[PDB]
Write a protein that binds this ligand. Structure first.
Ligand SMILES: [Mg+2]
Ligand SMILES: [Mg+2]
Ligand SMILES: [Mg+2]
Ligand SMILES: [Mg+2]
Ligand SMILES: [Mg+2]
Ligand SMILES: [Mg+2]
Ligand SMILES: [Mg+2]
Ligand SMILES: [Mg+2]
Ligand SMILES: [Mg+2]
Ligand SMILES: [Mg+2]
Ligand SMILES: [Mg+2]
Ligand SMILES: [Mg+2]
Ligand SMILES: [Mg+2]
Ligand SMILES: [Mg+2]
Ligand SMILES: [Mg+2]
Ligand SMILES: [Mg+2]
Ligand SMILES: [Mg+2]
Ligand SMILES: [Mg+2]
Ligand SMILES: [Mg+2]
Ligand SMILES: [Mg+2]
Ligand SMILES: [Mg+2]
Ligand SMILES: [Mg+2]
Ligand SMILES: [Mg+2]
Ligand SMILES: [Mg+2]
Ligand SMILES: [Mg+2]
Ligand SMILES: [Mg+2]
Ligand SMILES: [Mg+2]
Ligand SMILES: [Mg+2]
Ligand SMILES: [Mg+2]
Ligand SMILES: [Mg+2]
Ligand SMILES: [Mg+2]
Ligand SMILES: [Mg+2]
Ligand SMILES: [Mg+2]
Ligand SMILES: [Mg+2]
Ligand SMILES: [Mg+2]
Ligand SMILES: [Mg+2]
Ligand SMILES: [Mg+2]
Ligand SMILES: [Mg+2]
Ligand SMILES: [Mg+2]
Ligand SMILES: [Mg+2]
Ligand SMILES: [Mg+2]
Ligand SMILES: [Mg+2]
Ligand SMILES: [Mg+2]
Ligand SMILES: [Mg+2]
Ligand SMILES: [Mg+2]
Ligand SMILES: [Mg+2]
Ligand SMILES: [Mg+2]
Ligand SMILES: [Mg+2]
Ligand SMILES: [Mg+2]
Ligand SMILES: [Mg+2]
Ligand SMILES: [Mg+2]
Ligand SMILES: [Mg+2]
Ligand SMILES: [Mg+2]
Ligand SMILES: [Mg+2]
Ligand SMILES: [Mg+2]
Ligand SMILES: [Mg+2]
Ligand SMILES: [Mg+2]
Ligand SMILES: [Mg+2]
Ligand SMILES: [Mg+2]
Ligand SMILES: [Mg+2]
Ligand SMILES: [Mg+2]
Ligand SMILES: [Mg+2]
Ligand SMILES: [Mg+2]
Ligand SMILES: [Mg+2]
Ligand SMILES: [Mg+2]
Ligand SMILES: [Mg+2]
Ligand SMILES: [Mg+2]
Ligand SMILES: [Mg+2]
Ligand SMILES: [Mg+2]
Ligand SMILES: [Mg+2]
Ligand SMILES: [Mg+2]
Ligand SMILES: [Mg+2]
Ligand SMILES: [Mg+2]
Ligand SMILES: [Mg+2]
Ligand SMILES: [Mg+2]
Ligand SMILES: [Mg+2]
Ligand SMILES: [Mg+2]
Ligand SMILES: [Mg+2]
Ligand SMILES: [Mg+2]
Ligand SMILES: [Mg+2]
Ligand SMILES: [Mg+2]
Ligand SMILES: [Mg+2]
Lengths: 96, 275, 88
RNA sequence: GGGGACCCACAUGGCGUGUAAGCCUUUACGGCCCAAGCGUGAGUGGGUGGCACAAACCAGUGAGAAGCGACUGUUUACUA
RNA sequence: CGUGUAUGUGCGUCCAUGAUGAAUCAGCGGUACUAACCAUCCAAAACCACCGUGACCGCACCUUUCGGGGUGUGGCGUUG
RNA sequence: UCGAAGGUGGGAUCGGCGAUUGGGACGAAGUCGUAACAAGGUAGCCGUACCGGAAGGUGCGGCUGGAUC
RNA sequence: GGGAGACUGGAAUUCCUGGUGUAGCGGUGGAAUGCGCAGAUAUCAGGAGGAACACCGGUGGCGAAGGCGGGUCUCUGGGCAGUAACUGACGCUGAGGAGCGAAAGCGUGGGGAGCGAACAGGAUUAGAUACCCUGGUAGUCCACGCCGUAAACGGUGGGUACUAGGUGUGGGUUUCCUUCCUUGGGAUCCGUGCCGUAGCUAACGCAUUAAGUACCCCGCCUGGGGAGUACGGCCGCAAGG
RNA sequence: AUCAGCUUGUUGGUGGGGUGAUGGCCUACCAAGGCGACGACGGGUAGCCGGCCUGAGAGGGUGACCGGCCACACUGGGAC
């Protein structure tokens, strides 16, 4: 029950439309477990600083999460396992 | 873990064993036991095929589901992680949902209570066998097969198992415990996680009775062998044979790997030791 | 570290009244809950010497408080030690 | 290094077993005790005999150094 | 252990009580095929303003006797 | 029964001597060396491990009781 | 940057593979052992593995002290300010005892890119078993145990109360020129640098973060070698303490 | 403490003997403890005190003579 900030970068081979269904399906596990609140905003197609995974561009998605550490760890484990994702992290919105 | 035995007798002073606190049942399933016997290091022909081994403690056999492919889509809980001495590792029986129980190799850190799936939908907890189509590159794997569906043969060492490197085209690359890379099909069967009993390497043998039990026979050194019996034979005193060591069977140290295997083209380079 | 919910629950539930918080009873209650919880944590985390320092400090502090309770009143000391089920 | 045999007393002693009888009940090929009966070691005193009281048979010699081999093991059946 | 006698309990096939079960016609999963509405982030067919100037046209100074060349500004063009 | 003296047997302390060996100090003067004191010509020292007739050298970590810039 | 576990990032070194590309590359006060003509150096592409986190980064923060810094998560200690609700002599230091502890060293089992004792050569010197160059075995990394010593220094044990200031930094409460932006101004407590009174000290020097003036307890010292050594005792498998 | 545990009539109670007098002073029977880091048990030295010397004092050294006790009579014991 603590506010979390997560950003997800996806491979550019996927179109912009598929991102929203993919992200909502990914976070349905947290939606159905803790009864949480979320906020989603999207902006993609930015030139990357360097090559990552032999790729030059990507899409950025940022979600504000108010959930359980177990739930966010489960999302991280389920999501980093995916091949279409490149880099992710989770932070604390509050003081710590 | 590891428990060291106190020196009650001069013989068992150094004997230390890996205490098997990972045991749950003591009497193995009677249905799956097949008739087996110590072959004594001899073929049916009667000649001793390989010395230094044979005799000892007659033991039973049990079928392990090394090649688990027949049933998929059904879960199974860890029934009882019992002890099978016919292997360095342990075997943990499973209650599958169809009621057909098979032994499997017990991976590292497996305790009773986890649910194991064997198929495409299986997740990444250890004990899940699944083809390379459904595994990330870089995960530690064990009980690895060589073709899509012909029975698994490799990667069953206790403590260190094969590590997947990457997939390109229809061929997948596997890293060996020796530090080598082998090319293998992207559709072979492989499990996730290391194999348990990593502390078994910390076992201390202890005496000769345990060893006749385990199977090996005492080793006879060539330098005291007779010259007719061995190229190292002969001498009045201790002599090394006056020549480089050679197996008394004719060939000395050197290359033994006959090339041109069907998987020789599926190997990049050979092992290099002590680097 | 304990937080508001369970900590106010403990201070009230072992409190002499509904307002007092610094009573030795509540102090020992907080110390005991902290030590069992974080000892459970250290049963997993072995080599946290900086936290074992906290263990030893809080335990000596606890020992001083228990000695004070025993000195001031034997009956309250016995009641406290019996209600928490410890040895001393 | 000391005691060890026999007799008496402590001793109708302690211990085990367990009948009659007693206690009890889901009453039975039932649980508790158990006078009586049977078996029974241990010790302390007093006395006695012989040169000698584990008296027969049976039944470790001990101690101090140093060499080799860690030890239990196996081998030149029929010279080691 | 193994063969037979037939009487007594006694059972259906050829009647039929029970327990059920299953291979047939008529549509739906606010989810949400298709012209939009409200809210949010970015930019392809360069409009306005400044700055840097491939290269071009040159004004003033320095430099070898004049030459190359260097320094400030203007007109664009935009290697970008 | 006790009982001093005497004799059996193995443990502690004080010792005396003991081939030879290890170390230390004082002699005076000689060979081998340059160690330290000035950025002593490789900054010094401390803990530690290895090496070398010798003072010492090196590795790792720590201090400035180190001079220039 | 308090500690522990897990996940993850980039640059660099080395090695391997494949182009291109030619006779040198590396080296010091100078040169030679070193690798090349079997194709080095250089350079591009890819991969592998191990260590450590340049800038921020400071006479700055934290920790009791050793020490501590790529990010992310997980759990957790310590400290600080205000309200002051409550406990009402619980405070301090602490012989013997117990726990933590730089690097190196040891056992077991793994790892091992770079660096680097030992050891080979090449170089200087009358001489080098060193300083210099080319290589490189332990170790340096990981997990579990061990030894428990450092110029372990602020060469100053801790705690409390008092005693003139100036100049920076960090953290938090307030109030007022008030834009109410402002290291604006003021008050307050904690931490940390520098210079300075009275005072102390043999001097250098310390100077509210005292070596100032005192109180409480604890360890240590009584001329230099012998000697932090022999014996004895304790710990450690040993080195050894 | 470069001496950390000591003790078995040892400790305590009861009943007997014992001695001028109470008492493990001696015996029997019951229980397991007492002394121990505010230095026990061990090791070396030595008669103690009023006094003497030194020092302003504190203190340090010491036990000549005399005098108050203590212990011994070649060594070890025992008793009238
Ligand atoms: Mg042994
Ligand atoms: Mg079998
Ligand atoms: Mg034949
Ligand atoms: Mg063999
Ligand atoms: Mg046999
Ligand atoms: Mg096994
Ligand atoms: Mg052999
Ligand atoms: Mg032989
Ligand atoms: Mg031959
Ligand atoms: Mg033969
Ligand atoms: Mg021979
Ligand atoms: Mg010979
Ligand atoms: Mg050979
Ligand atoms: Mg290999
Ligand atoms: Mg906290
Ligand atoms: Mg009976
Ligand atoms: Mg009755
Ligand atoms: Mg009953
Ligand atoms: Mg006689
Ligand atoms: Mg034998
Ligand atoms: Mg033998
Ligand atoms: Mg034979
Ligand atoms: Mg013979
Ligand atoms: Mg024979
Ligand atoms: Mg013989
Ligand atoms: Mg002597
Ligand atoms: Mg002598
Ligand atoms: Mg000279
Ligand atoms: Mg010098
Ligand atoms: Mg020199
Ligand atoms: Mg020097
Ligand atoms: Mg020096
Ligand atoms: Mg040293
Ligand atoms: Mg060296
Ligand atoms: Mg250093
Ligand atoms: Mg100096
Ligand atoms: Mg850890
Ligand atoms: Mg290449
Ligand atoms: Mg290259
Ligand atoms: Mg490596
Ligand atoms: Mg009040
Ligand atoms: Mg305090
Ligand atoms: Mg204290
Ligand atoms: Mg104290
Ligand atoms: Mg002490
Ligand atoms: Mg102390
Ligand atoms: Mg400890
Ligand atoms: Mg310890
Ligand atoms: Mg180190
Ligand atoms: Mg270390
Ligand atoms: Mg060593
Ligand atoms: Mg080790
Ligand atoms: Mg090793
Ligand atoms: Mg090197
Ligand atoms: Mg070097
Ligand atoms: Mg060589
Ligand atoms: Mg050399
Ligand atoms: Mg010291
Ligand atoms: Mg330090
Ligand atoms: Mg200190
Ligand atoms: Mg103080
Ligand atoms: Mg202040
Ligand atoms: Mg003054
Ligand atoms: Mg003065
Ligand atoms: Mg000052
Ligand atoms: Mg002060
Ligand atoms: Mg002073
Ligand atoms: Mg000397
Ligand atoms: Mg000394
Ligand atoms: Mg000694
Ligand atoms: Mg009496
Ligand atoms: Mg009386
Ligand atoms: Mg008495
Ligand atoms: Mg008596
Ligand atoms: Mg006097
Ligand atoms: Mg005086
Ligand atoms: Mg005096
Ligand atoms: Mg006197
Ligand atoms: Mg007189
Ligand atoms: Mg008198
Ligand atoms: Mg006498
Ligand atoms: Mg006498």
């Amino acid at each position: 029950m603590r506010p979390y900030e997560i950003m997800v970068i996806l491979d550019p081979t996927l179109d912009e439309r598929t991102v929203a269904p993919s992200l909502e399906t990914f976070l349905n596990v947290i939606r159905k477990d803790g009864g949480t609140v979320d906020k989603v905003d999207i902006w993609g197609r930015r030139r990357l600083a360097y090559e990552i995974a032999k790729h030059a561009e990507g899409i950025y998605a940022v979600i504000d999460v108010k959930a359980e550490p177990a739930t966010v760890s489960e999302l991280d484990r389920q999501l980093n396992l995916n091949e279409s994702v490149l880099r992710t992290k989770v932070l604390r919105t509050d003081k710590h | 873990g590891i428990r060291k035995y106190k020196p009650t007798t001069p013989g068992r002073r150094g004997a230390s064993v890996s205490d098997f606190a990972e045991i749950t049942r003591s009497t193995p399933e009677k249905s799956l036991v097949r008739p087996l016997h110590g072959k004594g290091g001899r073929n049916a022909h009667g000649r001793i095929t390989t010395r230094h081994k044979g005799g000892g403690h007659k033991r039973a056999y049990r079928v392990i589901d090394f090649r688990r492919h027949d049933k998929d889509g059904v879960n199974a809980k860890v029934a009882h992680i019992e002890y099978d001495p016919n292997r360095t590792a342990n075997i943990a029986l499973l209650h599958y949902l169809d009621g057909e129980k098979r032994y499997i190799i017990a991976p590292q850190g497996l305790k009773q209570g986890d649910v194991i799936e064997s198929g495409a939908n299986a997740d990444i907890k250890p004990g899940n066998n699944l083809p390379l189509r459904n595994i990330p590159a870089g995960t530690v794997i064990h009980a690895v097969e060589l073709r899509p569906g012909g029975g698994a043969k490799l990667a069953r060492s206790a403590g260190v198992s094969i590590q997947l490197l990457g997939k390109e085209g229809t061929y997948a690359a596997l890293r060996m415990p020796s530090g080598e890379i082998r090319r293998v099909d992207v559709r072979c069967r492989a499990t996730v996680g290391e194999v348990g009993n990593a502390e078994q390497s910390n076992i201390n043998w202890g005496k000769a009775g345990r060893m006749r039990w385990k199977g090996k026979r005492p080793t006879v050194r060539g330098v005291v062998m007779n010259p007719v019996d061995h190229p190292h034979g002969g001498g009045e005193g201790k002599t090394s044979g006056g020549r480089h060591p050679v197996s008394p069977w004719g060939k000395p140290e050197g290359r033994t790997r006959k090339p041109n295997k069907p998987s020789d083209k599926l190997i990049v380079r050979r092992r290099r030791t002590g680097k | 570290a304990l937080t508001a919910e369970q900590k106010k629950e403990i201070l009230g539930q072992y409190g002499l009244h509904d307002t007092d918080t610094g009573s030795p009873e509540a102090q020992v209650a907080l110390l005991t809950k902290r030590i069992q919880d974080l000892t459970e944590h250290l049963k997993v985390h072995k080599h946290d010497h900086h936290s074992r320092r906290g263990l030893l400090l809080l335990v000596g502090r606890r020992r001083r408080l228990l000695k004070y309770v025993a000195q001031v009143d034997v009956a309250r000391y016995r009641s406290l030690i019996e209600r928490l089920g410890l040895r001393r």
